[PDB]
């Protein structure tokens, strides 16, 4: 990595001198906790019919959404102390921090 520099690289490369890929683009996320897969290394919970997670059936994401998340739109409560800009900056900021690619 360059002796001295005035500006960040575009890829984030060399921000950290000792480990120049940290925070750089096109690198694996860091794991704060070991991953939990059906087979221990790759298949997601919910992939194999009849495979329980820690003693219980895997709840359909859509079932959870329907039973816990769904609510009557006319019950929506406006946040008296937050603007919709609070919502939008979060999304804009999210787009500065992470994008998880998938095959097209």
């Amino acid at each position: 990595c360059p002796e001295q520099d005035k500006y960040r690289t575009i890829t984030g490369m060399c921000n950290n001198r000792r480990s120049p890929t940290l925070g750089a683009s096109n690198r694996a996320f860091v794991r704060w906790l070991p991953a939990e897969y059906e087979d221990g290394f790759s298949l997601p919970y919910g992939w194999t019919p009849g495979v329980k997670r820690n003693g219980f059936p895997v709840a359909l994401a859509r079932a959870v959404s329907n039973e816990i998340v769904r609510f009557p739109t006319d019950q929506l409560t406006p946040d008296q102390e937050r603007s919709l800009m609070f919502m939008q900056w979060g999304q804009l900021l999210d787009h500065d921090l992470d994008f998880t690619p998938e095959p097209a």
Binding site: F29, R31, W32, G55, V64, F86
Partner: protein, 466 residues
């Protein structure tokens, strides 16, 4: 294959299965489209599958400039030595710049209004067109970049294109960091979590890991609970922009034609300032515009964003609720009664348990947004821990943090400390009335607003090369 046209569960697809008696997808065998995130080490039978961040983790406005070199150069106006970002060569917004059009394969934006024929926008990040309000924020920072470069050029005539681009890019990056840590994060976390996870900055520490953590990509989706079911548009006097001031969200996703043909970014920016966010409540988590009708116009059926969040966490092999509570040093409820205590809501806890059986299996997003919000914050303890922990590592582990010694001068730092989102809007739009500080709190016109004229411009004097 195609994860979008079939329900076949084969690589790289992981379609969401439909529960019996669904209120919308009556066909129990149908599904909601889902592509597994690209694995860091394709097809390995040794590694534990992990996912990839395509972006720079740093708060460096890479959503403006790009995180890969081909793109970064393609985003820049290389036709002169003005150091500008390229702007749309087909349309302007009342004389002001719009983002240049992108060139995708089967452009999703084309599909939102077939007759309008307006493609998606090209930006530092591929999602700039996902909703017009995000598009307007992207355009705002593109204008601020070109403004800054123009000013710096009057300031320092000998400065070439590369220098001007880099200097303006550095100021924009500083602006995003300041608005984020000074104005935004304190309102997310609440004062108590702010003090715990974000103590006073001391200096750059090259031993702080700055990478985004896998769980963060799912936990920061707490924001989906803030989304209103409409895109609100207001005219110059902050009144409803007729004939359509409230557009259902299911008809604005990837709707770039609305920025180009329906009045530009000003009505959209006023809507963001003068309308409240949706408040997250335990029996009012997320709206059907994103739960039933997500991407309605560009998909075979409407998607479910909350459900997609949960399937993604599984795709990512993320531990459950209690494992994350433990990671954060928070008590781990093992029974319905204990969960009822933590959530301050036994009914919700009962609901959670009927679906998951054990609090150990609740998906991180679901458990995270279920928790009661911290005082003057908009997330509970678990999300506070995860979000606050991530942003500290992004500040502390950034050699280019705006306050780090050697990045900017003292006089430059003092000038940058005065920046605000409301003034930036004043600098790059036809809006002459903006929100009072803090912009993320203010939400009521005219009470929370003041004239642009009462806000001092950014003082660039200290960027003058002597």
């Amino acid at each position: 294959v195609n994860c979008e046209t079939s329900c076949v569960q084969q690589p790289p697809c992981f379609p969401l299965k439909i529960p019996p008696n669904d209120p919308r997808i009556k066909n129990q065998a149908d599904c909601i489209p889902f592509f597994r995130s690209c694995p860091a080490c394709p097809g390995s039978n040794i590694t534990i599958r992990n996912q990839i961040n395509a972006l720079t983790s740093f708060v460096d406005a890479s959503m403006v400039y790009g995180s890969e070199e081909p793109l970064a150069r393609n985003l820049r106006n290389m036709s002169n030595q003005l150091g500008l970002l390229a702007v749309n060569q087909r349309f302007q917004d009342n004389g002001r710049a719009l983002l240049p059009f992108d060139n995708l394969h089967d452009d999703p934006c084309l599909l939102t209004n077939r007759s309008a024929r307006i493609p998606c926008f090209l930006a530092g990040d591929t999602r700039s067109s996902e909703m017009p309000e995000l598009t307007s924020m992207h355009t705002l920072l593109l204008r601020e970049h070109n403004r800054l470069a123009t000013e710096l050029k009057s300031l320092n005539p000998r400065w070439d294109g590369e220098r001007l681009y880099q200097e303006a890019r550095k100021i924009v990056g500083a602006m995003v960091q300041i608005i984020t840590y000074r104005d935004y994060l304190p309102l997310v976390l609440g004062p108590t979590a702010m003090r715990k996870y974000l103590p006073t900055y001391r200096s750059y520490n090259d031993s702080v890991d700055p990478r985004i953590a896998n769980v963060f990509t799912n936990a920061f989706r707490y924001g989906h609970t803030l989304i209103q079911p409409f895109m609100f548009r207001l005219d110059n006097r902050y009144q409803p922009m007729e004939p359509n001031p409230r557009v259902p969200l299911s008809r604005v996703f990837f709707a770039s034609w609305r920025v180009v043909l329906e009045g530009g970014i000003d009505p959209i920016l006023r809507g963001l300032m003068a309308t409240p966010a949706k408040l997250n409540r335990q029996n009012q988590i997320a709206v059907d515009e994103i739960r039933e009708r997500l991407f309605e116009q560009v998909m075979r059926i409407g998607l479910d964003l909350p459900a997609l969040n949960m399937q993604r966490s599984r795709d990512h092999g993320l531990p459950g609720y209690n494992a994350w509570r433990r990671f954060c040093g928070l008590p781990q409820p093992e029974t319905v009664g204990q969960l009822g205590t933590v959530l301050r809501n036994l009914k919700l806890a009962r609901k959670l348990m009927e679906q998951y059986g054990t609090p150990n299996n609740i998906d991180i997003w679901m458990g995270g947004v279920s928790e009661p919000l911290k005082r003057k914050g908009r997330v509970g303890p678990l999300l506070a821990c995860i979000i606050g922990t991530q942003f500290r590592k992004l500040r502390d582990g950034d050699r280019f943090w705006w306050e780090n010694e050697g990045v900017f001068s003292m006089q430059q730092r003092q000038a940058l400390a005065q920046i605000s989102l409301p003034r930036i809007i004043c600098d790059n739009t036809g809006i002459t009335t903006v929100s009072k500080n803090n912009i993320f709190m203010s939400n009521s016109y005219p009470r929370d607003f003041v004239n642009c004229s009462t806000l001092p411009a950014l003082n660039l004097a200290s960027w003058r090369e002597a």
